[PDB]
């Protein structure tokens, strides 16, 4: 069943698995109409599909055109997400297909299960973890490709850059979740921490700056401090 603190190491074993996050699929700005009513305008979204072992990110861009003339968009977004994940699994060679898909929100279970009936051997699982994947649109290069898209498009990234050359998946995923947790709690602060020293740049083929092992430790400490401060503020403790 559900993925939790107890079965955490399973993410880094040799069974292919993908996380699916649908939180940035259907995005709107709410505005006033001339008559003073409220309306939404959809903006481009994305499905965040991640192999936590390899760092391979299957970023499916959701162009606003998919919502044209559709009703109940927040319900349709779960089904569109399941349709796109299913199409991705079918496009992969058999030996690359996942054995499990873990959805970050329980509302994705039935839509994915129904789309994947052809794949009875692929287990669809929820999680107890409160993963910060919603903050993926706070990564500048991912935000840039989503907002510039003029049509449906799939873009492949490695969300760990070259870290697996130096650290284990376990350590790479903990670093990723700490960066995204910080970006989600205080985006401006998190982004200042990452880019303040202009001598450390982001390679053209990377998402994150080229920190040495020592600089990652300092960065990781600043992100921890950011998170706990905001927690004392949120909760006056």
């Amino acid at each position: 069943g559900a993925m939790n603190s107890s079965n955490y190491a399973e993410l880094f074993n040799n069974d292919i698995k993908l996380f699916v996050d649908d939180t940035n699929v259907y995005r709107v700005t709410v505005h006033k109409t001339f008559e003073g009513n409220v309306a939404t305008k959809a903006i481009n979204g994305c499905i965040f599909t991640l192999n936590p072992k390899t760092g391979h990110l299957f970023l499916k861009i959701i162009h606003t055109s998919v919502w044209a003339g559709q009703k109940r968009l927040s319900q349709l977004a779960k089904w569109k997400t399941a349709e796109e994940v299913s199409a991705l699994v079918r496009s992969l060679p058999k030996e690359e297909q996942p054995k499990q898909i873990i959805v970050t929100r329980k509302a994705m279970l039935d839509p994915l299960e129904v789309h994947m009936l052809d794949f009875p051997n692929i287990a669809i699982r929820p999680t107890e973890l409160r993963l910060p994947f919603s903050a993926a649109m706070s990564i500048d290069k991912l935000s840039d490709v989503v907002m510039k898209a003029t049509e449906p498009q799939m873009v492949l990234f490695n969300i760990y850059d070259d870290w697996l050359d130096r650290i284990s998946s376990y350590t790479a995923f903990s670093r990723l979740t700490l960066l995204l947790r910080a970006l989600k709690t205080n985006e401006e602060s998190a982004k200042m921490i990452l880019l303040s020293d202009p001598t450390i740049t982001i390679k053209s083929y990377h998402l994150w700056p080229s920190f040495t092992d020592e600089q990652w430790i300092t960065i990781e400490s600043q992100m921890r401090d950011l998170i706990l401060t905001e927690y004392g503020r949120k909760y006056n403790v």
Partner: protein, 300 residues
């Protein structure tokens, strides 16, 4: 008016005939049930005074043969049997009636309850759900499992209800995943009604038989079948108007008949709340919604 004689009653037992029931004492001179209405299926059912586990019984139609009950001291149950000798049977029944050793099927003339619970139930359909082709009558008990329950183990002693599964390739057309899952009209009308049942009468007959097995034997798999068949109709946006009107009547008599004390194990909170308050048909079951709201407002 037809008769099911009993050879004897050697063990103390509560005997059910349709919705009626009688206590018989160990070695009481009880020789059976007379004045059984012709034209309907019937169920004769048993609960031993010494083992209130294993309710068991026999679905039969008196037009299909002469049936009697005889206790088997080896297998330890009241068994239905057919008497092929018509003259031996008439002669046995006439004696027991003369000696008034038979209870009378106690039907009130105003009372259409049994007709209303068995309107679409046919003995030929019961015999396809309960397979024992050498007998004209069908044995059911508390513990028998359904074909669907066995997939998720003895096939000889199983209830072969039609398998309904909302998350199955049968239920969901490729490329209509969201549409077929949120509106089950395709699954109800093409797969189930046109494809498997052929007409709404056979569909209602299985639904009614599943309810009665759930109520009379506390058969859990029958209860699951009855709820699934209700939910498939309530979760369809497109249902023939006559089917909706008839479903309302069927469910009304089922809820009216259910023992008040069993509503907590025989009624699935989620299905009834969904069917009466959320589903496409939420406004189509007026009689059923009124009896449920007045008799079981806790469940809702």
């Amino acid at each position: 008016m037809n008769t099911v004689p009993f050879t004897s009653a050697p063990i103390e037992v509560t005997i059910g005939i349709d919705q009626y029931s009688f206590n018989v004492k160990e070695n009481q001179p009880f020789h059976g049930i007379k004045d059984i209405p012709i034209g309907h299926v019937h169920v004769i059912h048993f609960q031993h005074a010494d083992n209130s586990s294993m309710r068991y019984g026999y679905w039969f139609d008196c037009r299909m043969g002469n049936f009697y009950i005889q206790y088997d001291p080896k297998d330890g149950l009241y068994k239905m049997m057919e008497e092929r000798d018509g003259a031996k049977f008439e002669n046995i029944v006439h004696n027991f009636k003369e000696r008034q050793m038979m209870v009378s099927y106690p039907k009130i003339d105003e009372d259409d309850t049994w007709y209303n619970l068995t309107e679409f139930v046919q003995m030929d359909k019961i015999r396809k759900i309960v397979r024992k082709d050498e007998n004209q009558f069908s044995y059911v008990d508390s513990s028998m499992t359904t074909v669907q329950e066995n997939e998720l183990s003895d096939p000889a002693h199983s209830l072969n209800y039609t398998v309904i599964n909302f998350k199955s390739r049968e239920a969901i057309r490729p490329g209509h995943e969201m549409e077929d899952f949120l509106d089950k009209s395709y699954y109800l009308n093409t797969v189930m009604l046109q494809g498997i049942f052929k007409n709404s009468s056979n569909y209602f007959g299985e639904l009614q038989f599943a309810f009665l097995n759930a109520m009379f034997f506390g058969n859990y798999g029958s209860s699951l079948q009855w709820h699934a068949m209700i939910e498939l109709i309530c979760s369809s946006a497109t249902v023939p108007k006559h089917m909706l009107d008839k479903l309302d009547e069927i469910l009304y008599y089922q809820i009216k008949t259910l023992p008040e004390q069993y509503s907590d194990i025989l009624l699935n909170e989620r299905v009834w709340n969904i069917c009466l308050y959320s589903s496409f048909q939420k406004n189509s079951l007026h009689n059923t919604e009124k009896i449920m709201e007045n008799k079981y407002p806790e469940l809702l």
